[PDB]
Amino acid sequence: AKKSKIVKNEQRRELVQRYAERRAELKRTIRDPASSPERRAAAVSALQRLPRDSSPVRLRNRDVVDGRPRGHLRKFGLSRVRVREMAHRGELPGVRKASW
Amino acid sequence: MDVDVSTDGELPGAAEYAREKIGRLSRRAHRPVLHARVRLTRHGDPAVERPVIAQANLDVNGRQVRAQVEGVNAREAVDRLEARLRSRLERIAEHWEARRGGVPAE
Amino acid sequence: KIRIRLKAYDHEAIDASARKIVETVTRTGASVVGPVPLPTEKNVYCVIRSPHKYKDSREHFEMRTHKRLIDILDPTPKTVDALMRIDLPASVDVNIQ
Amino acid sequence: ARLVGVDLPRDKRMEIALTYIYGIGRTRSNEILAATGIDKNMRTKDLTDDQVTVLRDYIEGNLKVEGDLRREVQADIRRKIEIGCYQGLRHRRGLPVRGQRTKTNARTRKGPKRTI
Amino acid sequence: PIQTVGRRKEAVVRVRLVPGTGQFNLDGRTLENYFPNKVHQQLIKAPLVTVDRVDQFDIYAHLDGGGPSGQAGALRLAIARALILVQPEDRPALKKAGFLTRDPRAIERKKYGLKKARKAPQYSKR
Amino acid sequence: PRSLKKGPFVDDHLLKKVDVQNEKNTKQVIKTWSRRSTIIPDFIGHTFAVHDGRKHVPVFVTEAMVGHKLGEFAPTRTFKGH
Amino acid sequence: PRKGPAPKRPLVNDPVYGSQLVTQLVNKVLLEGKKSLAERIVYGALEQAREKTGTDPVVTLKRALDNVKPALEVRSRRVGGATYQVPVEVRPDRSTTLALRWLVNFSRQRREKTMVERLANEILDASNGLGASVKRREDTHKMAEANRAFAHY
RNA sequence: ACUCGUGAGAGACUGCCGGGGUCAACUCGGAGGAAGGUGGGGAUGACGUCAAGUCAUCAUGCCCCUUAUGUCCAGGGCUUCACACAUGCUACAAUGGCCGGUACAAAGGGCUGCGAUGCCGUGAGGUGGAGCGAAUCCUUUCAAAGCCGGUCUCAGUUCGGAUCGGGGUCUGCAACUCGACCCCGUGAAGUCGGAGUCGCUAGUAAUCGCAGAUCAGCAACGCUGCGGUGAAUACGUUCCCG
């Protein structure tokens, strides 16, 4: 798509692995049990202070080379346009046209 | 008769002119017309000698009558579209006066 | 008894793998249950042909995984070493449990 | 029978006859009938006066129905209107207030279709 | 013993026949608790009727797949095969009755671009 | 609505703003951008300049409007009729 | 049917009456594939008719069919670039199909609160010559008669 | 042993018989067989047409911006509504609604995912984690229509669910604009729909449920598949379209 947006997606992923791995997950563990004292702890407020880009909810599965944000397939990490072209060329092992 | 015009780009005044020019053809149709639509488009490339493209579709009692013309401006395209639609409706009539010379005789 | 699980994208490759696997384990002198087939697993995906619009034109693709199961008995260390000393085609995987 | 100023239907099963009360639906009718004890399958013409009294006192005790409920709902809507909230001006011009689409639908709040 | 199978559009019936009385054991349930429909019972017992050999064979059946109708059809085909195995010479009467032919009427595969196997999306010329 | 376990969501910015505003019992006009913040009984007297998209609308909180969010009282779209 | 006539489906006889006609009737009243419900409706209607009249369902059903069975109909035929309502002779199979269809359809519009009762009343009236299907047969025969002049082509 | 799973193979080739046929193609009927005449369905789309669609999957000639038409962020918008058109879903009910009992599928998915037993809620759901990279465990042992029993008695109703008030759950940093679901109440239009028009030839139309992709959550009634129950009709090319 756009080079800047392809890059920014990756930057979100490295931000996610750096922050969402433990910082943005221990706060969730605090909020889960009503027994846990969340209200004074401000685990909500502390987790607000974290960057938005820490949250995986901001991620977007784009095509691994093409950058296409829609028509994505999780098995291949490829757009529907690219999967069709590489399967036809025999590039994805064990993939072929269907009949039944 | 009510017409909907789906213009495109910058065609100021084309919608009203097309509406009033096409709505006059209701009397020409020998059967009631339903949901008569028009569409105006302009070619982006300046290399086209007739950039404006006009399309019209009418539903005369279930029979679809469509026409398409090209022109240098909205007014010329609308006028040519009106002439084309008039010719099509003339050829569509199907009433007795237009189907009396083809019925076997003698 | 240990299970040898054979998964392949290719039918002929899976058959060859089973055949020489049983060949070497019966060379080493072990009782084999034979290449028991397992249900083929099918993955199906439907895509649209054209880059833009034209939704009504679709392509289907599938991926087919064939599965073979080998069960042997009397696991002598000679058979164990022979098993760890086998070269296999890259289409076929081996799971030893 | 006259129940809280509401004339019950001529012949209905008791919970569904009680549904005719403005503050009672079906679940409320079923649970209150179970609580006070009168049978649910028994008709309206078989009610004894003591039964009318016991439903009267129970309903007036742990329920609010009819005029009080109507006026409380009206007052709530009016107060929601007068504070200037989104639902306020939504109520003022007779449009759906729960985020419903209005491009094509919402003739219920708009009333019957008008032409122009 | 003798055992046969009948197949009807994803319904499979494995049948075992003995010379006992006219008792049906469909996975431990009788012809009433299983198949509570008179038409299905006719479809089941038709080969016996045309072969005259009703109430002289005790049947056990293992059923899997399909619904009641497909299961009944597969069971009838399996009964016909068991009858022909037990007595060959009545093949005409059964074969002219059509009970010896498997029915290749399966669910047609759905196609892309259509709502169903043959139903097409509504097309408005306007 | 927000789950009861998590507690009401109020942004920290206007939070510390209102604690420093109510500590001297004076209620000056507070200008904020966080429409998503709910209304706390600590806002009863304060008036907020809540963002709309073009400007800030002044909203004087009362006891009735507690529990709502600020964005309720800053209508975004302007429609007058055809 | 451009390449010739199509084969007919040989529907089977009924279990509790042993006649083709009742099976045809249950197939006609069949809706959404609920064959059990259609069979229940037809059997109940036949039993109701038996209780009312005291005779066998099948004989009065056949009497009703013969009462509502048409013999002449009207079809739109185009000869010489002109269309006319030509009376045409009806084959026996088409007459039986039309009679059964009329019986079912007119029984569906009755006001007897239940399909079984409506069907029983309709079949009894057709047996006695009072049903609306009898009226439809009279009207279609009248229309065939009125256009007899166009019978020559 | 019977299914089933998946490897190899056989089996339909007008092979045989009778008759039409230029004794030619081909055609009608019959036997056999599971299947008879390209068995059923798919994949496969000739030269080209319509300057068809796509400079927004991607690439690209030329032109243009380059302290911006590039790039970062918050908020908002793409969800606006006096109307018009199109595709669908739910209905207008007794071939039904509600309640209780009860029987049968196929296919597919699952590791920081599927997630059971148990316990707490009326219910979304909460706690908890058994077992599973899975013909094993979980999606419940899988369904609903279906069958049996009770009730409703033709009414704008025990139909229909819109709209609205209040109270909650889950995800997400955040459900105001702008999520889904749960509970209580509320109970609109709607009485089978004009001119006109669409789909379908058999496991088809109709109807019922299940699963998957995308996906933190969902606007999914959409799309792609799977099975359950399963019809009517075709006289024949005069008219309509290609």
Long-range pairs for D62-65 at CB < 8 Å and ≥24 separation?
A: D63/D23, D63/D24, D63/D28, D63/D32, D64/D23, D65/D4, D65/D21, D65/D22, D65/D23, D65/D24
Beta strands in C11-85 (DSSP E): 36-48, 58-71
The superfamily CATH assigns to domain C1-97 is Ribosomal protein S10 (3.30.70.600)
Under 8 Å between Cβ of C2 and C72: yes
* Chain G residue numbers touching E38 (CB-CB < 8 A): 15-16, 39
- Which has the closest alpha carbon to C64: A90, A92, A96? A96
Under 8 Å between Cβ of D64 and D72: yes
CATH number of the domain to which F80 belongs: 3.30.860.10
What interhelical angle do G132-146 and G115-128 show, nearest 10?
50
Touch criterion met for G and C (3+ Cβ pairs within 8 Å): no
Question: DSSP readout, E33-89?
Answer: TS---HHHHHHHHHHHHHHT-TTS-EEEEEEESS-HHHHHHHHHHHHHHHHHHH--T
User: What is the separation of C-alpha D78 from the centre of its chain, rounded to a whole number of angstroms?
Assistant: 18
Tell me D25's DSSP state.
Answer: -
CATH class name, domain E1-126 = alpha beta
Beta strands in B1-106 (DSSP E): 3-6, 33-42, 52-60, 63-71
Nearest nucleotide, CA D97 to C1': H164
Beta-bridge partners for B52: B42, B71
* Chain F residue numbers touching A34 (CB-CB < 8 A): 5
CA-CA distance, B68 to B39, in Å (whole number)? 9
Under 8 Å between Cβ of G68 and G138: no
- Which has the closest alpha carbon to E125: C56, C52, B34? B34
CB contact under 8 A, D86 and F65: no
Q: Does E123 touch chain C (CB under 8 A)?
A: no
* Chain B residue numbers touching E125 (CB-CB < 8 A): 64
CB contact under 8 A, A75 and C47: no
- Which has the closest alpha carbon to E9: E63, E51, E75, E71? E71
Under 8 Å between Cβ of E121 and E114: yes
Under 8 Å between Cβ of G48 and G120: yes
What interhelical angle do G57-68 and G92-108 show, nearest 10?
100
User: E39 vs chain G: nearest CA distance in angstroms?
Assistant: 8
Sequence ranges of the domains in chain G: 20-147
Nucleotides of H under 7 A from a protein CB: 1-8, 32-35, 39-44, 53-54, 56-58, 70-77, 79-88, 94-96, 103-109, 112, 126-128, 134-135, 143-148, 152-154, 158, 162-166, 168-180, 183-188, 195-207, 213-216, 223-239
- Which has the closest alpha carbon to E58: E114, E2, E117? E2
CA-CA distance, D85 to C42, in Å (whole number)? 56
Coil vs helix vs strand at C62: strand
Token digits of residue A64: 């691994």
Token digits of residue A11: 């930057």
Q: In whole angstroms, how far apart are CA B72 and each of B20, B51, B77, B85?
A: 20, 6, 7, 19
Helix (H), strand (E) at residue E93: helix E91-97
Looking at the 3D structure of chain F, how many domains does it have?
Answer: 1
Q: Which residue carries 């709040």 as its tokens?
A: D109
Under 8 Å between Cβ of E29 and E125: no
Residue type at C62? E
CA-CA distance, A46 to A55, in Å (whole number)? 14
G25 CA, H107 C1': separation in Å? 38
Residue in chain F lying closest to A46 (CA): F12
CA-CA distance, B35 to B37, in Å (whole number)? 6
CA-CA distance, A92 to B33, in Å (whole number)? 56
Beta-bridge partners for B55: B39, B68
Tell me A30's DSSP state.
Answer: H
Overall resolution, Å: 3.5
Task: Say how many Å lie between the first and final Cα of chain E, rounded.
Answer: 69
Experimental method: cryo-EM
| Sign for the pseudo-dihedral over CA of D45, D48, D53, D58 | negative
C56 CA, H105 C1': separation in Å? 30
Question: Which CATH fold would you assign to the domain G20-147?
Answer: Ribosomal Protein S7 (1.10.455)
Chains that touch B (3 or more CB pairs under 8 A): E, G
Under 8 Å between Cβ of B64 and E125: yes
* Chain F residue numbers touching A40 (CB-CB < 8 A): none
Helix (H), strand (E) at residue E12: strand E11-18
Token digits of residue E29: 């349930």
- Which has the closest alpha carbon to B83: B96, B71, B100, B97? B71
Q: Which residue carries 């499979």 as its tokens?
A: E12
Helix (H), strand (E) at residue E4: strand E3-8
Long-range pairs for B94-102 at CB < 8 Å and ≥24 separation?
A: B94/B30, B95/B30
Rounded to 10 degrees, what is the CA torsion of E84, E85, E87, E90?
20
- Which has the closest alpha carbon to E13: E85, E61, E84, E70? E61
Q: Residue B29: how many CA atoms within 13 Å on its side-chain side?
A: 21
Structural domains in chain D, sorted by start: 1-71 (1.10.8.50), 72-116 (4.10.910.10)
- Which has the closest alpha carbon to G103: G75, G82, G127? G127
- Range of F11's domain? 1-82
